[PDB]
């Protein structure tokens, strides 16, 4: 089992969410995050201003997904979350051992 983490541009959240629900995803979590990654020496644009090394407002988006889904659900995210402009974000994939619903007890 795997944990997809998508650090995405604030406004995109809806476009991604709907894309995932359409792709049939059950449980997501979002958190407010500041981030940065710039080249190769480059500047990202945020609220009209150019920034080099300082942290900018983004959104960490966490789902846990069955191993086989990983490939095409990244495909679904990137498609929805991309502007092609500097600072679209990064996706991180990590292993997950166990998934417990608290209301029932269902372990996966």
């Amino acid at each position: 089992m795997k944990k997809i983490e998508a650090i995405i541009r604030p406004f995109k959240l809806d476009e991604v969410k709907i894309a995932l629900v359409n792709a049939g995803i059950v449980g997501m979590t979002v958190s407010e995050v500041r981030g940065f990654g710039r080249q190769k020496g480059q500047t990202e644009r945020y609220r009209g201003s150019e920034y080099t090394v300082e942290f900018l407002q983004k959104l960490k988006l966490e789902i846990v997904v069955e191993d086989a889904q990983v490939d095409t659900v990244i495909d679904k995210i990137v498609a929805a979350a991309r502007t092609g402009e500097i600072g679209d974000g990064k996706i991180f994939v990590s292993p997950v051992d166990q998934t417990i619903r608290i209301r029932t007890g269902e372990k996966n």
Partner: protein, 284 residues
């Protein structure tokens, strides 16, 4: 038993009025709607109407043709290097005098007499826009937006004033820079988290097939727009205008509109009417 039932048509604006109620709109007032009186006078009335209703309109302006005049009155020739105007230390001084002094306060003057409360700015006012030398090498004092600080204008915006900003900004040293109007509009719009960035222009929008109006595309998103540049359909400068929109939309702006400023009341046509006057770029 009477006469002008303009009421029925007024009641029909209600859904649109609700739809952008309280929203912010950055308009690039330029060229076509700027030279022709009938159009110029129409824009001001649209702007003040928007403000009156409870939306937050911000005018950003340039005035190349306007500059061209005064240059030819101090004995200096106009010259363009694909899109940006090459401006030395002597020509800069004129740009600043025309845009900040003569044009900006014409727009403010009109709005005020129309019944709004305009407040005119340029980049260097309270560091609203701070300029850097534009990436392009050898084009003189042509600027690019390095940062936008709206701490200055959003107080006035809440108080129901109409900011009118010229596209001229000083660097960290005090040197003035001629920045492209569109980009400033885009970056102001981004900084204000504007609902709409509307660019008035001398084109009916973005034509699907140029041959060959009207095939004007109603809506595009970023990938669709980006592709059209590669396919050559979006050409000339169009190109930088579409670039602007994308760059602005990426930053948070929900909608960018490239509309035909050549026709009377182009603004209200876009906001309150389903009638196509330009291409809307989102978003998705």
């Amino acid at each position: 038993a009477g006469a002008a039932d303009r009421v029925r048509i007024l009641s029909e604006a209600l859904p649109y009025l609700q739809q952008f109620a309280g929203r912010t709109v950055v308009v690039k007032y330029g060229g076509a709607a700027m030279k022709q009186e009938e159009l110029k006078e129409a824009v001001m009335r649209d702007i003040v109407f928007l403000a009156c209703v409870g939306m937050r309109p911000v005018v950003v302006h340039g005035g190349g043709p306007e500059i061209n005049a005064w240059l030819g009155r101090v004995g200096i020739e106009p010259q363009f290097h694909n899109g940006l105007r090459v401006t030395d230390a002597d020509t800069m001084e004129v740009v600043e005098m025309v845009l900040v002094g003569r044009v900006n306060k014409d727009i403010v003057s009109r709005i005020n007499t129309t019944g709004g409360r305009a407040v005119g700015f340029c980049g260097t006012d309270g560091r609203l826009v701070l300029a850097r030398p534009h990436d392009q090498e050898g084009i003189g004092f042509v600027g690019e937006v390095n940062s936008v600080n709206s701490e200055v204008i959003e107080p006035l915006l809440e108080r129901g004033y109409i900011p009118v900003i010229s596209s001229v900004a000083a660097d960290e040293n005090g040197q003035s820079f001629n920045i492209n109007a569109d980009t400033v509009a885009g970056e102001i719009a981004a900084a204000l988290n504007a609902e709409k960035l509307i660019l008035l222009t001398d084109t009916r929008g973005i034509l699907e097939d140029p041959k060959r109006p009207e095939s004007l595309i109603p809506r595009l998103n970023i990938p669709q727009s980006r592709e059209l540049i590669a396919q050559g359909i979006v050409g000339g400068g169009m190109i930088p205008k579409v670039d602007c929109c994308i760059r602005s939309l990426a930053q948070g702006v929900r909608a960018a509109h490239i509309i035909d400023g050549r026709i009377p009341h182009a603004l209200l046509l876009e906001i309150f009417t389903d009638a196509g006057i330009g291409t809307m770029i989102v978003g998705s």
